[PDB]
Point group: D2
């Protein structure tokens, strides 16, 4: 079986990610819906690695937040978990905007996000 | 000044070319370490002169994926892209997921 | 409640034992994945009931070093250590430094 | 030649790190001096890996900031650089204190620090 990025995904926080069809070049776009009732959507786009047509490919995407000057990038692998469900194991970097090059040092946060099909 | 469009290099001599950034902030380019495509977006919320951006390099010579995020600055008057990245390796079993992600920095200057 | 002292485990079944935390916030312990020592400190500035802490595991079966940092929380009423870590591998040449560091998370619960 | 952690080190920002003697078990303590004129010192302690008595060992330490509720951990390798100087290539995680487990996700920052002998 293969894990496929296309579809709707959710995480522990109830965020909602929708990824479109992956084209011939491994490119895809989608939307990332998060709460802050108050919910907001931001576009995302990235690629799935296609090198040896693995059934569990690595991928990455950038979320261009519409409600902040920040940017978050996610990278991970689309796995068929031991329990048979597809799962996206990802890690992310959240970059904040700073005005002075001197404050660059503390502008990057890191964390994880695990998604399963909605 | 500090436009992503153009050619960039780093201490290792890699070559990153970024094309025009469209009205939505989207851009594509290539990364030569031998050449792989990259796609990303620059944030445009407050039309900043030094916005944050992120991109994904879809390596064509391995099953891995690397993502970069950072901001452009003017140090002299020299432009610099200060970025941090996550390199995701492909593992065969989900049990090895925990050691599949490397992290680091990459500072680019105009070639 | 939420004292670091005690025995902790995780989803992988590792076993982390932490001893008493001294007046300066210092502590030692062991990490069984097979047993390696760890040393760290918990911040005590505002005598928080859920202070931040960090520690270093000095692996005895490899040339690597892993550092952890996080905070204890009460989810039910169950205590949990939410930590993030950096695993540093030993490389022979400084040229390979850029790919020597892995990053991840580890959530611990009382054993 | 061997790279040795003991001594005084500085980075690009002029921060100042002093590391004491490394004992038989690879343990060491020291102080980390940073600016915010206005300078402050915080204690640090960690270990150097001794497994195959490498000339360029890995190590890690925790800085217990005295002026914040935060904690930073550093890990890296003590190298003899190509130019012959000893250099500490490190990466760090800076953990901020949050009150709600719900805000744990954005409490960790990541970055690098390169030190050379003062």
């Amino acid at each position: 079986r293969k894990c496929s990025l296309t579809g709707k995904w959710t995480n522990d926080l109830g965020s909602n990610m929708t990824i479109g069809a992956v084209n011939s070049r491994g490119e895809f776009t989608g939307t990332y819906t998060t709460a802050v009732n108050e919910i907001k959507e931001s576009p995302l786009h990235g690629t799935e690695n296609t090198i040896n047509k693995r059934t569990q490919p690595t991928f990455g995407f950038t979320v261009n937040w519409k409600f902040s000057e920040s940017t978050t990038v996610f990278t991970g692998q689309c796995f068929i978990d031991r329990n048979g469900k597809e799962v996206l194991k990802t890690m992310w970097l959240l970059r904040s905007s700073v005005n002075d090059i001197g404050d660059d040092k503390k502008a990057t946060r890191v964390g994880i996000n695990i998604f399963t099909r909605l």
